[PDB]
Every structure is written in structure tokens, then in C-alpha cells.
Design a protein around this ligand. Structure first.
Ligand SMILES: [Ca+2]
Ligand SMILES: [Ca+2]
Ligand SMILES: [Ca+2]
Ligand SMILES: [Ca+2]
Ligand SMILES: [Ca+2]
Ligand SMILES: [Ca+2]
Lengths: 113, 111
């Protein structure tokens, strides 16, 4: 029902959103453990997910709308560490960590099948 | 152009179907720059949107038109054995014609 693609480049979240929109897709969002693994497999390295709590701190929402349903946070995450972390990356083992949206991570876009 | 991959390896027929589902086309390098860019995204052998399925020895883009830029490996294309009508960019950027039924990495392009 979804295809996940990457050009392997690492960039800040704003650039990922721009890239995926230009391809007419959206930033990858895993709706379950299966999709999560798929994203991990495609990215191979840390990648941003289309999820942020930029609107209301602590309330993670999908960039396409709606409150986060499925999640796979790494232990003790999200932690809004340091000056603040409003973006989400799928790290090693497919676990999630909230991180600065200014950090550079692999762009993965999704397309509806 | 943007070149994207999901890393899966499949026969050419499936690569075409895949890129069309994404509303893109199979990757086609129009120059050395694009050829290197596809090489870097695929990181392994990948199919290019170029075949001589219509007329043997006359490679054409799947989107129409005769092949302009090429980067064949020495002694290629050789339509080896029973036949080879597809084109793969290999690990070093060079090209080899190969069976369309062989499985290689899917790389799609978007304008
Ligand atoms: Ca915040
Ligand atoms: Ca936050
Ligand atoms: Ca964190
Ligand atoms: Ca032939
Ligand atoms: Ca041939
Ligand atoms: Ca050959």
C-alpha cells in the first residue's frame, strides 16, 4: 500500500519535506511495525520520519495531519533534549529518537500504492 | 533530475511497473553526470530505461528516441547467448546489455 524511496542524501528536515513534495510524495511515516522495518531497510542509516511536535510541544503529529498513533520510541525518548528536539528520526534497530529538525538525516519519501 | 531507489532487485518488467506506479520513469542517464548520479544511488547493478527490444542492436529509451549518450563496457553490447535486450549500469558506471529477465536494482527518475 506504500512504497518508500530514497536518493540516500542527508539533509535537514525542511529540505526533506521540500524534496518529497517535489517528487509528489510525502515524508515517510510508518503506520505500523512492518512499514517501520521497510523504512529502516530502505534508508539503511538514520532517517527523518514525517512526524513532529513543532505545533504543541510533546504532541507528535504527522506532517499530513493527525496525532501520532503507532510509535517505536527508543527508551527514554522522546526527550526534547538540549535546546529542543521537534523532529523524529528512525535510528539503529528501527527505534525512534526525537532530534533537532536542523540535524541532517536521510531523506525517505513515501508514495501510496 | 532526481534518482530514487527502494533498493529492490527485480526483472525489468517489474522496474517499469514500479516507476510508473510512482509516476516516474526508469532511470535514464543522458550524460556522464547523470550516469555517475545513478551509479551512486544504486550502489550495485541497476537497470536503465534503455532497451533494443524493438529492433535488435538499436537501443532506444523506453520513453522514445534513439540512444545518444552511452557508456558501454568494451565489447558490449553483445546480445549474449539467447539474447540481451536490457541495459544495466554496473558497479563502476560502465554498461552491459543483459537479459530483461535478470534481476537488478530499480532506480526511477523524476523531473
Ligand atoms: Ca518544541
Ligand atoms: Ca519536542
Ligand atoms: Ca532525543
Ligand atoms: Ca533482441
Ligand atoms: Ca539485444
Ligand atoms: Ca552483454
Amino acid at each position: 500500500k506504500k512504497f518508500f524511496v530514497t536518493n540516500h542524501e542527508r539533509m535537514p528536515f525542511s529540505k526533506v519535506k521540500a524534496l518529497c513534495s517535489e517528487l509528489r510524495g510525502t515524508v515517510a511515516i510508518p503506520r505500523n511495525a512492518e512499514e517501520n522495518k521497510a523504512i529502516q531497510e530502505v534508508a539503511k542509516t538514520s532517517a527523518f520520519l514525517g512526524i513532529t511536535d513543532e505545533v504543541t510541544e510533546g504532541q507528535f503529529m504527522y506532517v499530513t495531519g493527525g496525532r501520532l498513533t503507532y510509535s517505536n520510541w527508543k527508551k527514554d525518548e522522546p526527550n526534547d533534549h538540549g535546546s529542543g528536539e521537534d523532529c523524529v528520526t528512525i535510528v539503529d534497530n528501527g527505534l525512534w529518537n526525537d532530534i533537532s529538525c536542523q540535524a541532517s538525516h536521510t531523506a525517505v519519501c513515501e508514495f501510496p500504492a
